[PDB]
Structure formats: structure tokens, C-alpha cells
């Protein structure tokens, strides 16, 4: 059923999280960090060889239900880790010295919906008071300038901020996990599509983070690294001026907790296919994105 070169439905990805953990017990363990609105387990894979006092990098995919290449990329990252550990000096060093928390799908209820009913759904599938319109934008539901700019207060809108910050079970589960592990998590990476960008804070206001120069230089070099493979062109910069203002994002929230390396990736393409990126582009998109993620990982490891 599962293939890393096709899009996999939730049943298949869930079964994969179990099987990949079973097949690689020395590098992977699996937990659930909460349940979704509909009661599905939100699985998280911890990827790394055990060791003392290891720092960690946290990566999630699948915030937005229709962005199928995001879900495929978290799977590809785990595929690379298990395949190349032992053979490739950098990935082996990475897994020996840090752990990666990989959350392959945050918004599982929306993801199921995109397979059963509406390919173009974005939000969660929770209800809203006073209306029949469904869902909240999880990337406007974090407590970071919550509901102030670039988010809608209308529950029927695609960027609805929700009833309160962390009103969604899924964003509360993610925020609780990160707060519970803040002393080990040194970087936060959140994978989306489309439009080919590497963003860092801030998006909730036009303001820049304390380590702006460092983030700017790191994002510039990771885009240069991404382009080596296929010439794919990314832009980069602080979210508010690089893409648009958007309050309530998990990247900004994570940075405000003290996680100094916080990045949002918008993968391929630039709009020819948009969210319906064909399966035939999974491999090239994931391979080039692996080069930027490994670049960032190496940097974090080298600047502890």
C-alpha cells in the first residue's frame, strides 16, 4: 500500500508510522501527542540514535489538508534517515548527535476529508458556534499576535483564527509538546506548499527578530543549497514582507518561546499545479528540499 513516491492516504500513513518504527527500533520511536477533533491519534516519530542530553529539531508537515507534498516530504525525510544512516557522513552525524521529532501529519481530520470529499480543503474539521461552517486555520490558531492581521474572524473563511488561540485540539497538542520539551528543542521547521519560499519570523507584525542577520544568512544559504540540485528558485526572508502578514503562526509562536531557528518552508510549485502537484514531482521536490533541511540541520549542530 505505501510508497514514498505517491501520495498516501491517512490509513496508509498511520500504518507506515507503525511499520517504520518496528523496522528501525534503534533509530525510531513513536508516540501520540494528542487526538484530533474527530479522535484520531496525532503520531510523532522521534528519529535519532539514543544518547545523553541530545538537542532536538522539531519538524511538522500537514498543517493544511490540501498541501499533500508537505505530508509526502515528512515521510521522505524519514525514508532518507533510515536509508542513509551509516553510509552518509552528515546524516549519520546528525542522527548520532541530535534527535528529530517528525510529526508527519498534524491536521489528520482535514487530510482524510481531502481524500474522501474535497481535495481543496485547508482547515481543520471542527465545528464553530453560531454557524454550520466548519474548521479553523491551524496556522492562524497559535498564540502569536493571535487574530490580528492576515487572519479572518469569520469561521466561514479559509484563514479563520478560531475561537481562541489553541482552541483546536491539534494546535493545543503541538504547543503542549513543544512547551514540554522546550529545553531540548533548538530549531522548529514547519512544511507547507506552495510558492517556493523559506520564511522566518515575523509574520504577525512587521518586526524582525533579534537574530535577523543570522536567520537571513542561513535562509539565503539554504536556498542556494536547494537550487544546486535542479535549479529550483526559492525566495526567503521574514514572513510579513516575503509572503504576507499572517498572525497566529506556529513559527512565530515557537520563536517567541525562545527557539531561535524557526522556519516555514513553502515547497513546489509556483502555481502551475499549485496544491495538486503531481506525484511525478514528489521525488525531485523531496530530494532538493532534503538539501535545504540538512543545511539548516548542520548549521544548528555547528552553532550550539
Ligand X SMILES: C[As](C)(=O)[O-]
Please, what is the minimum distance in Å from the beta carbon of residue 1 to ligand DDK?
Answer: 28
When asked if residue 264 is in the footprint of ligand DDK (CB under 6 A), the reply is yes
Of the two residues 48 and 249, which places its CB atom closer to ligand DDK in the complex?
A: 249
When asked if residue 64 is in the footprint of ligand DDK (CB under 6 A), the reply is yes
Q: Find the helix or strand (DSSP H, E) in which 267 lies.
A: strand 261-267
When asked if residue 243 is in the footprint of ligand DDK (CB under 6 A), the reply is yes
When asked if residue 140 is in the footprint of Zn ion (CB under 5 A), the reply is no
Residue range at the interface with ligand DDK (CB under 6 A); choices 36-44, 45-53, 238-246, 278-286: 238-246
Q: Cα(109)–Cα(170) distance, rounded to whole angstroms?
A: 10
List the helix and strand counts (H, then E) for the chain: 9, 8
Q: Cα(107)–Cα(250) distance, rounded to whole angstroms?
A: 13
Q: What x-and-dash track marks residues 149-188 binding ligand DDK by CB under 6 A? A: ----------------------------------------
Q: Cα(17)–Cα(22) distance, rounded to whole angstroms?
A: 9
CB 77 within 8 A of CB 60: no
Q: Which residues bind ligand X (CB under 6 A)?
A: 193-195, 243, 266
The one among 56, 64, 242, 289 contacting Zn ion by CB under 5 A: 64
Q: Cα(272)–Cα(280) distance, rounded to whole angstroms?
A: 14
Q: Cα(92)–Cα(85) distance, rounded to whole angstroms?
A: 5
When asked if residue 71 is in the footprint of Zn ion (CB under 5 A), the reply is no
Q: Is 88 a catalytic residue?
A: no
CA distances, 82 to each of 75, 101, 123, 262, 281 (Å): 11, 14, 32, 25, 22
Please, what is the minimum distance in Å from the beta carbon of residue 12 to ligand DDK?
Answer: 24
* Residue 197 burial class via C-beta count within 10 angstroms: exposed 0-12, middle 13-18, buried 19 and up: buried
Q: Cα(13)–Cα(79) distance, rounded to whole angstroms?
A: 13
Active-site choice (88, 266, 287, 288): 266
When asked if residue 239 is in the footprint of ligand DDK (CB under 6 A), the reply is yes
Please, what is the minimum distance in Å from the beta carbon of residue 70 to Zn ion?
Answer: 7
- Residue 255 assigned ligand-binding role: no
Of the two residues 95 and 186, which places its CB atom closer to Zn ion in the complex?
A: 95
When asked if residue 61 is in the footprint of ligand DDK (CB under 6 A), the reply is no
Residues 89-113, buried b or exposed e (16+ Cβ, 10 A)? eebeebbeebbbbbbbbbbbbbbbb
DSSP-assigned letter for residue 152: B
The item of Zn ion, ligand DDK, ligand X, none sharing an interface with residue 170, based on CB under 5 to 8 Å by kind, is: none
- Residue 295 assigned ligand-binding role: no
Residue nearest to ligand DDK (CB): 249
Please, what is the minimum distance in Å from the beta carbon of residue 271 to ligand X?
Answer: 7
Write out the binding residues.
64-67, 122, 139-140, 192-194, 244
Catalogue the active-site residues: 266
Write out the binding residues for Zn(2+).
64, 67, 192
Amino acid at each position: 500500500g505505501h510508497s514514498y513516491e505517491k501520495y498516501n492516504n491517512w490509513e496508509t500513513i498511520e500504518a507506515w508510522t507503525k511499520q517504520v518504527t518496528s523496522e528501525n527500533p534503534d533509530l525510531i520511536s513513536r508516540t501520540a501527542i494528542g487526538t484530533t477533533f474527530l479522535g484520531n491519534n496525532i503520531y510523532l516519530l522521534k528519529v535519532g540514535k539514543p544518547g545523553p542530553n541530545k538537542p532536538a529539531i522539531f519538524m511538522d508537515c500537514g498543517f493544511h489538508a490540501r498541501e499533500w507534498i508537505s505530508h509526502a516530504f515528512c515521510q521522505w525525510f524519514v525514508r532518507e534517515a533510515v536509508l542513509t544512516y551509516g553510509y552518509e557522513s552528515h546524516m549519520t552525524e546528525f542522527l548520532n548527535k541530535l534527535d528529530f521529532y517528525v510529526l508527519p501529519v498534524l491536521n489528520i481530520d482535514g487530510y482524510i476529508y481531502t481524500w474522501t470529499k474535497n481535495r481543496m480543503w485547508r482547515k481543520t474539521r471542527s465545528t464553530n458556534a453560531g454557524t454550520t461552517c466548519i474548521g479553523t486555520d491551524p496556522n492562524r490558531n497559535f498564540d502569536a499576535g493571535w487574530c490580528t492581521t492576515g487572519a479572518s474572524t469569520d469561521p466561514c473563511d479559509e484563514t479563520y483564527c478560531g475561537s481562541a488561540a489553541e482552541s483546536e485540539k491539534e494546535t493545543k497538542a503541538l504547543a503542549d509538546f513543544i512547551r514540554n520539551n522546550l529545553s531540548s528543542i533548538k530549531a522548529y521547521l514547519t512544511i507547507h506548499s506552495y510558492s517556493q519560499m523559506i520564511l522566518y519570523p515575523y509574520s504577525y507584525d512587521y518586526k524582525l527578530p533579534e537574530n535577523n542577520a543570522e536567520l537571513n544568512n542561513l535562509a539565503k544559504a539554504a536556498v542556494k543549497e536547494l537550487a544546486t540540485l535542479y535549479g529550483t528558485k526559492y525566495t526567503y526572508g521574514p514572513g510579513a514582507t516575503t509572503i504576507y502578514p499572517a498572525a497566529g503562526g506556529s513559527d512565530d509562536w515557537a520563536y517567541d518561546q525562545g527557539i531561535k531557528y524557526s522556519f516555514t518552508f513553502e515547497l513546489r510549485d509556483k502555481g502551475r499545479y499549485g496544491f495538486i502537484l503531481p506525484e511525478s514531482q514528489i521525488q525531485a521536490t523531496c530530494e532538493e528540499t532534503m538539501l535545504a533541511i540538512k543545511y539548516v540541520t548542520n548549521y544548528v549542530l555547528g552553532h550550539l
